[PDB]
Amino acid sequence: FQALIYWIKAMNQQTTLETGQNHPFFRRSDSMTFLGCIPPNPFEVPLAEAIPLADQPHLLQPNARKEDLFGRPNCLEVLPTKMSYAANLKNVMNMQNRQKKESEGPPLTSFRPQCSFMGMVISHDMLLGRWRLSLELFGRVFMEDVGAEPGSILTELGGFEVKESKFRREMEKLR
Amino acid sequence: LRELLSAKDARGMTPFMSAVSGRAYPAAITILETAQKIAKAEISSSEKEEDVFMGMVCPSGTNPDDSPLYVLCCNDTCSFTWTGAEHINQDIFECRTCGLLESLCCCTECARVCHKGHDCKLKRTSPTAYCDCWEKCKCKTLIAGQKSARLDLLYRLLTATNLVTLPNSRGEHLLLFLVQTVARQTVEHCQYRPPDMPDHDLEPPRFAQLALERVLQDWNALKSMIMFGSQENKDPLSASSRIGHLLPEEQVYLNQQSGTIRLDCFT
Numbered sequence: 001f002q003a004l005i006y007w008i009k010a011m012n013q014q015t016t017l018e019t020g021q022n023h024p025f026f027r028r029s030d031s032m033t034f035l036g037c038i039p040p041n042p043f044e045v046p047l048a049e050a051i052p053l054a055d056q057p058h059l060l061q062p063n064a065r066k067e068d069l070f071g072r073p074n075c076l077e078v079l080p081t082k083m084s085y086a087a088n089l090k091n092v093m094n095m096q097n098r099q100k101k102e103s104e105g106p107p108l109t110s111f112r113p114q115c116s117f118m119g120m121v122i123s124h125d126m127l128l129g130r131w132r133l134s135l136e137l138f139g140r141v142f143m144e145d146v147g148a149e150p151g152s153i154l155t156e157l158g159g160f161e162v163k164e165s166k167f168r169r170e171m172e173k174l175r
Numbered sequence: 176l177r178e179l180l181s182a183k184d185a186r187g188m189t190p191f192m193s194a195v196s197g198r199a200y201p202a203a204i205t206i207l208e209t210a211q212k213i214a215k216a217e218i219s220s221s222e223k224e225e226d227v228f229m230g231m232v233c234p235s236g237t238n239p240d241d242s243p244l245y246v247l248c249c250n251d252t253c254s255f256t257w258t259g260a261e262h263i264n265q266d267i268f269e270c271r272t273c274g275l276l277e278s279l280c281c282c283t284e285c286a287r288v289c290h291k292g293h294d295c296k297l298k299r300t301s302p303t304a305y306c307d308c309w310e311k312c313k314c315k316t317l318i319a320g321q322k323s324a325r326l327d328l329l330y331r332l333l334t335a336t337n338l339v340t341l342p343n344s345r346g347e348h349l350l351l352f353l354v355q356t357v358a359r360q361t362v363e364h365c366q367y368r369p370p371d372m373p374d375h376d377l378e379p380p381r382f383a384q385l386a387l388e389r390v391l392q393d394w395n396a397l398k399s400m401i402m403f404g405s406q407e408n409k410d411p412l413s414a415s416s417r418i419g420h421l422l423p424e425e426q427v428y429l430n431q432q433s434g435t436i437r438l439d440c441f442t
């Protein structure tokens with residue numbers, strides 16, 4: 001999984017290369033914008049409910065799940081509902097069948113690749129949205145090993161202690 | 176008559192339900208025939224025939240543990256009527272509400288009927304025991320009644336009423352209750368031997384086997400048991416039965432599975 005995201009992530013880097021409630025003051029900020037998610041709007045949702053940490057300040061713990069503190073949030077749109085392995089495989093293949101069913105002009109500097117098969121467009125945020133719990137669990141259990149890959153996507157699920165591991169190294173280096 | 180038969184006593188029971196509770200099966204039959212006549216007489220009303228009939232037989236808001244078709248099956252005799260004071264290997268219960276603390280005990284039938292609604296717990300001592308309930312208390316399982324009338328009443332209820340579809344107060348569908356009963360009796364009755372204290376030396380009851388054989392012939396009973404645990408046939412108890420208060424995402428997952436633990440335990 002880690003490697004197959006690497007491939008799509010690289011492809012995506014090739015693809016990218018008011019008083020409104022939409023004004024940046026009203027938008028959700030750092031820690032608040034969940035993986036591939038859209039805000040529980042703070043003008044429709046009670047403060048108490050939108051941010052249980054802002055409601056209850058003593059709720060913060062070092063190893064609390066981020067989902068608590070800021071309120072719980074086609075091949076990818078339909079959720080992983082079935083538990084059976086086999087039916088998922090069969091559905092995967094049927095969905096894949098749905099999508100199945102000198103250079104003149106551009107020089108290389110103008111090459112416009114992407115990932116387009118299996119889904120019509122994949123961006124890694126969607127997949128981080130889909131397998132959210134599996135990811136978080138890997139983001140605790142496999143961090144020492146799969147997290148040692150260069151730029152391993154598991155470190156992005158790294159909580160407090162990952163940042164603190166850098167903190168000692170930097171502060172002791174500065175000391 | 177409709178009023179007198181739909182009126183409820185101090186324990187919620189119509190006269191019909193009382194006749195069943197007291198083992199007066201011919202009286203229960205007499206009233207049940209009459210109740211059908213009464214319901215069929217008031218067909219000129221803006222009620223459905225059934226509403227009146229169900230009102231007299233088993234009224235709306237009845238605690239499921241008192242539904243007549245279930246009560247008729249619970250009405251077996253205490254083991255003591257056929258074991259006497261001999262010690263046989265059987266299940267036993269303490270009853271703390273009654274001072275039947277852990278040295279003392281009663282057999283399964285007393286616990287189900289003589290101590291209904293008390294604090295009773297399945298005891299952990301050796302199973303080789305008779306049942307103290309006839310001696311320490313006013314034991315209601317000592318009387319067999321008329322066996323032929325008990326069976327006739329069962330047949331009538333099975334065709335008169337939809338009561339076969341209800342689970343009991345522990346979520347057991349009637350069939351799952353009967354088959355466990357037969358399996359239990361099979362072991363207990365094999366210990367029986369021919370030859371102020373109550374009448375002993377009676378022959379053991381075969382009603383559960385007869386009842387199981389007859390109920391298994393009813394399509395509705397069988398369909399109702401096999402479809403148990405489906406989304407339609409929602410088990411009231413111990414079975415994720417309240418869900419509307421959870422946020423919608425968890426409902427859309429948790430509606431998708433279906434239950435078989437009881438269907439598998441029966442089979």
Ligand SMILES: [Zn+2]
Pocket residue numbers: 253254255281282283284285306307308309316
């Ligand atoms: Zn007994």
Ligand SMILES: [Zn+2]
Pocket residue numbers: 253281284285286289308309314315316317
């Ligand atoms: Zn008793």
Ligand SMILES: [Zn+2]
Pocket residue numbers: 270271272273289290293294
């Ligand atoms: Zn008792």
